[PDB]
Design an enzyme around this catalytic site. Structure first.
Site, short mmCIF file in Angstrom:
data_model
loop_
_atom_site.label_atom_id
_atom_site.label_comp_id
_atom_site.label_asym_id
_atom_site.label_seq_id
_atom_site.Cartn_x
_atom_site.Cartn_y
_atom_site.Cartn_z
N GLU B 189 -5.81 -6.06 -6.40
CA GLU B 189 -4.46 -6.65 -6.40
C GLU B 189 -4.33 -7.95 -7.19
O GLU B 189 -3.32 -8.68 -7.13
CB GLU B 189 -4.01 -6.83 -4.96
CG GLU B 189 -3.96 -5.50 -4.27
CD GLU B 189 -3.26 -5.56 -2.95
OE1 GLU B 189 -2.97 -6.69 -2.50
OE2 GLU B 189 -2.97 -4.48 -2.39
N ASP B 224 -3.66 -10.78 5.33
CA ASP B 224 -3.78 -9.42 5.79
C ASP B 224 -5.22 -9.13 6.13
O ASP B 224 -6.10 -8.96 5.26
CB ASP B 224 -3.25 -8.41 4.76
CG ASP B 224 -3.26 -6.98 5.27
OD1 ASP B 224 -3.76 -6.70 6.39
OD2 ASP B 224 -2.76 -6.09 4.55
N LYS B 322 6.37 0.00 3.59
CA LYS B 322 5.75 0.71 2.48
C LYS B 322 6.51 2.04 2.33
O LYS B 322 6.28 3.02 3.09
CB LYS B 322 4.28 1.00 2.77
CG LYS B 322 3.44 -0.24 2.98
CD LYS B 322 2.02 0.15 3.37
CE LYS B 322 1.03 -0.96 3.04
NZ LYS B 322 -0.29 -0.70 3.72
N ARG B 351 1.48 -1.09 -2.79
CA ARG B 351 0.23 -0.48 -2.39
C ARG B 351 -0.86 -1.00 -3.34
O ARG B 351 -0.54 -1.48 -4.42
CB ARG B 351 0.32 1.06 -2.50
CG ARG B 351 1.38 1.70 -1.60
CD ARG B 351 1.27 1.23 -0.13
NE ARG B 351 -0.01 1.51 0.53
CZ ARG B 351 -0.25 2.51 1.39
NH1 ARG B 351 0.66 3.43 1.67
NH2 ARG B 351 -1.45 2.61 1.96
O1 LIG Z 1 -2.87 -3.08 3.44
C1 LIG Z 1 -1.85 -3.32 2.74
O2 LIG Z 1 -0.91 -4.03 3.15
C2 LIG Z 1 -1.71 -2.70 1.36
C3 LIG Z 1 -0.99 -3.62 0.35
O3 LIG Z 1 -1.77 -4.75 -0.11
O4 LIG Z 1 -2.96 -2.21 0.84
P1 LIG Z 1 -3.23 -0.64 0.60
O5 LIG Z 1 -2.24 -0.10 -0.40
O6 LIG Z 1 -4.68 -0.58 0.15
O7 LIG Z 1 -3.01 0.00 1.96
MG LIG Z 2 -1.97 -4.17 5.23
#
Ligand SMILES: O=C(O)[C@@H](CO)OP(=O)(O)O
Ligand SMILES: [Mg+2]
Ligand SMILES: O=C(O)[C@@H](CO)OP(=O)(O)O
Ligand SMILES: [Mg+2]
Ligand SMILES: [Mg+2]
Lengths: 437, 414
Positions: B189, B224, B322, B351
């Protein structure tokens, strides 16, 4: 009719400001974004920075942006220029500044307008951008030629923290039969490389450099190249993937010699190489690895080293900092037989038309042309359409990681789909994609 | 009218295939790309199933609710496992873009219309910038996944992104100086990725960076933890990438005590997934006294049934939104509306496997949430959203306000 020209500050892929231009016409609003180099050549056209230490550590582009809004925009709009006539557009923009290196207004003020104008023109003509760019460059379109992507899967030099001096280690899937194949199998080599690098040099060696390549803390070109060949083989693609290097040797040229430990401030000077010595190192790599292209093997004004090396080279040699996408410097390079391919970076010269001329000059000399990103890139996908329009057969636009890289590679997927049977993949004919069929 | 719907495979920001959908109308071609945290089948399901059905149907794209009811009813599985939530989402999102172009309005204005949000001033979000990457997003020891900076003290979004970028650049240089040049290379990220073992180490750098950049008092911190990723045999392994010593794994109250000590030392204003995804009790316990925003991600997985449970149990006070988890725009809006109704916050999120798509930038503005996380200010799958927010702020002039210290309740601001 261009009703408005407007510029703003946005951020590139390193988190540094750059210039974005929007041109408004009856067909809508057309946006182009100027990229930014880290290993910039001394001879590049001017990238204007604000130097206000209180904002972005001096790296603001508010002055460049101001030059678009307050100077270029009214002149442009009042002139009522036909955006389809790119030469007119760029002749006009060039005349606003009246210095060869665009030091008055900034190359990063002018370029966004040049590019956005070409986008507007394609819209006016109801054609995809790559078609318009083929028209502007008088390139063949029956078949179009899709490029081999040179994917920079291991980064060093000025693009990644670590000891490795050479800047870029690229794979090129010349044995693929389509662009989609080339991208798929290149992405597989990359994923293998990441796994393997993390198995060999530790988990942190898999974190990425500026162009999305893995960045192991290694010291030698041989260790980089052994890792890449192991990944080519482990992914199942032996024989179908070749290698390209960008040494960016100007970055390590000091006092007539080449420092292969240049990011160590206590580098041992008795270990710095002369030109002949670095040539021997290249020849050794060329003999041991499936290397089909080497970029900036010597420094940007070390002409005798280039000429001497080229004499016995027999693979593609790309001029990047040597030529700065500048027809004047390309002429000198052709005269001296310094190289046989141009790395085309539109922001080094600062207009679309001068970039097309530099490509046309290269082709006329029998050189190849590799269209290129900068290490500071954006969501802009112009160069995907440019390398197709110019029919060059070869692009470098990053590892298949970080979306300032994939944005161009995905766009190439889209173009290949659109073209269908009217495009061919350059494959092993990448050096002269422009003469293919 | 939609004349064509078409999907293809493109690559995300890690070089993995994902689904892109294009909808063609008289206004043009409208593209949506699905992020990721099978692709061939999803693309086929769009081209062979959704596309003919949707084109035949002649659904009004401005009527997002009808679009999404059509799609759900076509799929006919609660979890969208018949056609794939990725196949469904691409069409859902692209329909909204086609709808905005028809209306001759920017997408965020259209999404405000859809969610019935106030437009009196529009609210620009505080960007929670993930400047130091750990956990599953970066090679290294560091267990907690994201260490974010939140410029809550800026006066405009532009300012926020500028001072955030300055902190990030200061971080990179401090990190290379302190942990060696390799540590300044980036994770998924865009954050720097030092090989460090504790949150205090990571948080120490960030505070130094905040100070070196001149922004003490104006930058807060969000975490997070993604604790579910290191929740094993009922305990928490802060060395989960390493064989980690089992005697050093923490219980929930030991992990909670960790958080309190961080909360005292550091200007932390939000923590996401402090506990494992089905440990409602720990969440509910921690929340009673936490005193800051607690964000539900893995706990709720953007599912209305688990979101309602979280509200009732008072497990948190903000939802991580999300869109790719719930699979339609309508349902996402509903999720955020249910959250606001409960007095919760909503953080719109990317994501880790992202694309050049900028949908969530327009979405965070349209939903008026006041907070987004969409990466470090590095890697253009992150900057593309942050740049899009600059454009939105600029366009809106006096008609927009930065959420600043009110990010938790951005939806109620002005
Ligand atoms: O855990 C999270 O909040 C996401 C976004 O940073 O990560 P990932 O897309 O790997 O679930
Ligand atoms: Mg998360
Ligand atoms: O050297 C190059 O050819 C380019 C892109 O790889 O790097 P930079 O943008 O830093 O000059
Ligand atoms: Mg180069
Ligand atoms: Mg405030």
């Amino acid at each position: 009719a261009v009703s408005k020209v407007y510029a703003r500050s946005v951020y590139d892929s390193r988190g540094n400001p750059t210039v974005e231009v929007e041109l408004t016409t009856e067909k809508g609003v057309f946006r182009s974004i100027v990229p930014s180099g880290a290993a910039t050549g001394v001879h590049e056209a001017l990238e204007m920075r604000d130097g206000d230490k209180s904002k972005w550590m001096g790296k603001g582009v508010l002055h460049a942006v101001k030059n678009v809004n307050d100077v270029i925009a009214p002149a442009f709009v009042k002139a009522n220029i036909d955006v389809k006539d790119q030469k007119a557009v760029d002749d006009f923009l060039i005349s606003l500044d009246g210095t060869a290196n665009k030091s008055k207004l900034g190359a990063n003020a002018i370029l966004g307008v040049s590019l956005a104008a070409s986008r507007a023109a394609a819209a006016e003509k109801n054609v995809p951008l790559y078609k318009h760019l083929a028209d502007l460059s008088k390139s063949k379109t029956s078949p179009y030629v899709l490029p081999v992507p040179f994917l920079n899967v291991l980064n060093g030099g000025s693009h990644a923290g670590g000891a490795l001096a050479l800047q870029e280690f690229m794979i090129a899937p010349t044995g693929a039969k389509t662009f989609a194949e080339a991208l798929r199998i290149g992405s597989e080599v990359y994923h293998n490389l990441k796994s393997l690098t993390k198995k060999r040099y530790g988990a942190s060696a898999g974190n990425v450099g500026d162009e999305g390549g893995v960045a192991p803390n290694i010291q030698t070109a041989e260790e980089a190249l052994d890792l890449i060949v192991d990944a080519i083989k482990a992914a199942g693609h032996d024989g179908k993937i070749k290698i390209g290097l960008d040494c960016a040797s100007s970055e390590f040229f000091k006092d007539g010699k080449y420092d292969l430990d240049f990011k160590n401030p206590n580098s041992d000077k008795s270990k710095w190489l002369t030109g002949p010595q670095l040539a021997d190192l290249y020849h050794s790599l060329m003999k041991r690895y499936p290397i089909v292209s080497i970029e900036d093997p010597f420094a940007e004004d070390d002409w005798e080293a280039w000429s001497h090396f080229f004499k016995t080279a027999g693979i593609q040699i790309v001029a990047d900092a040597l030529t700065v996408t500048n027809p004047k410097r390309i002429a000198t390079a052709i005269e001296k037989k310094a190289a046989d391919a141009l790395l085309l970076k539109v922001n080094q010269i600062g207009t679309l038309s001068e970039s097309i001329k530099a490509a046309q000059d290269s082709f006329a000399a029998g050189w190849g042309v590799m269209v290129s990103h900068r290490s500071g890139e954006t969501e802009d996908t112009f160069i995907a359409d440019l390398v197709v329009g110019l029919r060059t057969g070869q692009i470098k636009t990053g590892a298949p990681a970080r979306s300032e890289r994939l944005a161009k590679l995905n766009q190439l997927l889209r173009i290949e789909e659109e073209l269908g049977d009217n495009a061919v993949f350059a494959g092993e004919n990448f050096h002269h994609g422009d003469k293919l069929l």
